[PDB]
């Protein structure tokens, strides 16, 4: 290949989801968490089991 024409294999890379960056991403304000309660809080949620 050339170092100016590098190309990954198809379907092998993907961009990560970036949460909380504005309304049109679909993950805008509450960032995927829903509204209140224990699972909305930072470091929240209940231990497994």
């Amino acid at each position: 290949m050339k170092l100016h024409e590098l190309k990954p294999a198809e379907g092998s890379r993907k961009e990560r989801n970036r949460v909380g960056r504005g309304v049109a991403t679909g993950n805008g304000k509450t960032s995927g968490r829903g509204h209140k309660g224990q699972k909305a809080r930072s470091g929240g949620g209940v231990r497994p089991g």
Binding site: V23, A24, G28, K29
Partner: protein, 102 residues
Amino acid sequence: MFAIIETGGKQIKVEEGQEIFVEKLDVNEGDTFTFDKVLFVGGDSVKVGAPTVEGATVTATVNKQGRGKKITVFTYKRRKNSKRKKGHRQPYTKLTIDKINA
């Protein structure tokens, strides 16, 4: 002398020599288009369409296949988090009538 032609989905009143703007036709610039749905030829002698006049064409020449001025379709909802911005340009075609034929 004047006529009422049907083009696009609408109706237009024309006289010889005026420039009109019309929904996009499939012709080229410089060509000659002929409208055949004529509903009313007025002026000196008056012909009234059956729906149409059955004769009755108008010929015009195509200048400028063009695209219209941009409008910005924006809508939102007030305390939901949703809005949509869209751009639009509508295609038109411009013509210059030479000859109405009763």
